[PDB]
Design an enzyme around this catalytic site. Sequence first.
Site, short mmCIF file in Angstrom:
data_model
loop_
_atom_site.label_atom_id
_atom_site.label_comp_id
_atom_site.label_asym_id
_atom_site.label_seq_id
_atom_site.Cartn_x
_atom_site.Cartn_y
_atom_site.Cartn_z
N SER A 52 22.17 20.49 2.22
CA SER A 52 23.10 20.10 3.29
C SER A 52 23.72 18.72 3.08
CB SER A 52 22.41 20.12 4.65
OG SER A 52 22.01 21.43 5.04
N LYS A 55 27.36 18.48 2.64
CA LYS A 55 28.38 18.50 3.69
C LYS A 55 29.25 17.24 3.66
CE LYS A 55 26.28 21.80 6.89
NZ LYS A 55 24.84 22.02 6.59
N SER A 100 24.25 20.67 11.14
CA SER A 100 24.13 21.20 9.78
C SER A 100 24.47 22.69 9.72
CB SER A 100 22.74 20.95 9.21
OG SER A 100 22.69 19.76 8.45
N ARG A 232 11.30 12.76 6.90
CA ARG A 232 12.46 12.22 6.19
C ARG A 232 12.93 10.92 6.85
NH1 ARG A 232 16.38 17.35 6.67
NH2 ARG A 232 15.43 17.27 8.75
C1 LIG Z 1 20.67 21.66 4.82
O1 LIG Z 1 20.08 21.14 3.87
C2 LIG Z 1 20.10 22.88 5.50
C3 LIG Z 1 20.25 22.67 6.99
N1 LIG Z 1 20.22 21.23 7.17
C4 LIG Z 1 19.13 20.83 7.81
C5 LIG Z 1 18.86 19.34 8.05
O2 LIG Z 1 19.86 18.60 8.09
O3 LIG Z 1 17.70 18.88 8.19
C6 LIG Z 1 18.40 21.86 8.20
S1 LIG Z 1 16.91 21.80 8.96
C7 LIG Z 1 17.02 22.70 10.53
C8 LIG Z 1 18.22 22.17 11.30
N2 LIG Z 1 17.72 21.08 12.17
C9 LIG Z 1 16.26 21.27 12.37
C10 LIG Z 1 15.57 19.94 12.15
O4 LIG Z 1 16.12 19.07 11.49
N3 LIG Z 1 14.36 19.74 12.71
C11 LIG Z 1 13.68 20.70 13.56
C12 LIG Z 1 13.63 18.50 12.50
C13 LIG Z 1 15.81 22.37 11.40
C14 LIG Z 1 19.07 23.15 7.85
C15 LIG Z 1 18.06 24.05 7.15
C16 LIG Z 1 20.93 24.08 5.07
C17 LIG Z 1 20.84 24.30 3.57
O5 LIG Z 1 20.49 25.25 5.77
CL LIG Z 2 25.61 23.08 3.74
#
Ligand SMILES: *C(=O)[C@@H]([C@@H]1NC(C(=O)O)=C(S[C@@H]2CN[C@H](C(=O)N(C)C)C2)[C@@H]1C)[C@@H](C)O
Ligand SMILES: [Cl-]
Length: 247
Positions: A52, A55, A100, A232
């Site tokens: 991600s 992006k 995301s 992170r």
């Molecule tokens: C990007 O790498 C993936 C999506 N991006 C992210 C991210 O930015 O962390 C997630 S994680 C998902 C979305 N927000 C939640 C979170 O951060 N927490 C619960 C802490 C879980 C996606 C998976 C993309 C490749 O799918």
């Molecule tokens: Cl993405």
Amino acid sequence: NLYFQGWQENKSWNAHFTEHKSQGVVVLWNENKQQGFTNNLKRANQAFLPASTFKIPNSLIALDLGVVKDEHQVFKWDGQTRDIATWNRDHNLITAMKYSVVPVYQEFARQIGEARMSKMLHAFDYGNEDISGNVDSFWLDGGIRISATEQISFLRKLYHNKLHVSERSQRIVKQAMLTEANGDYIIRAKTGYSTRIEPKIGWWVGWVELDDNVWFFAMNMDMPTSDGLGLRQAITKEVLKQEKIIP
Ligand SMILES: *C(=O)[C@@H]([C@@H]1NC(C(=O)O)=C(S[C@@H]2CN[C@H](C(=O)N(C)C)C2)[C@@H]1C)[C@@H](C)O
Ligand SMILES: [Cl-]
Ligand SMILES: [Cl-]
């Protein structure tokens, strides 16, 4: 023509990883002093799928080409109910990045197309510049790879409006990267979680704006389960706190 004094190692930061029984790297760059610091010089230079964090360049290209008119344009949910609930709704560029929302960015990618995507990443000097794979998923399970130190180089150009897209495009993405701001600092950054291809890692890249300096950062860390996703930001801020960058 150009000089780089070389990264400085600081293994004391590994405590913040071992304290949570985790493995990874944090890279910091002091912009005023042009000095770099990392807990693991080898892993700082190891290139992974950007997932991600892609992006950021994807937004820049989509804006510069007119695929995205501005940060208000609404990208209607396509109807497919997906496992991340916040994806199952309409979005603009600001909320698509905050949450995301992969499917919005996959559409960007398809509209950008292979030839323009490849040309732009070369102009960006982004990672290994290799988009092999599906045009709408190569940053998830194709050929592109970027290291933490390469993420810093790319981010420094974005910060200084030096990338080969319009200033407006760069300003809009830095707006969308806004993550946190208070009376001590501004953080512009993007999270990532790479799961489709081993090894599974979390990313957080961006920078900390202070009154009179900017600290760029790029971190990644092994992420076998989503339980430690919060690490992170937490580990990065522990290193920021230790170095006295944020209170
Ligand atoms: C990007 O790498 C993936 C999506 N991006 C992210 C991210 O930015 O962390 C997630 S994680 C998902 C979305 N927000 C939640 C979170 O951060 N927490 C619960 C802490 C879980 C996606 C998976 C993309 C490749 O799918
Ligand atoms: Cl993405
Ligand atoms: Cl802003």
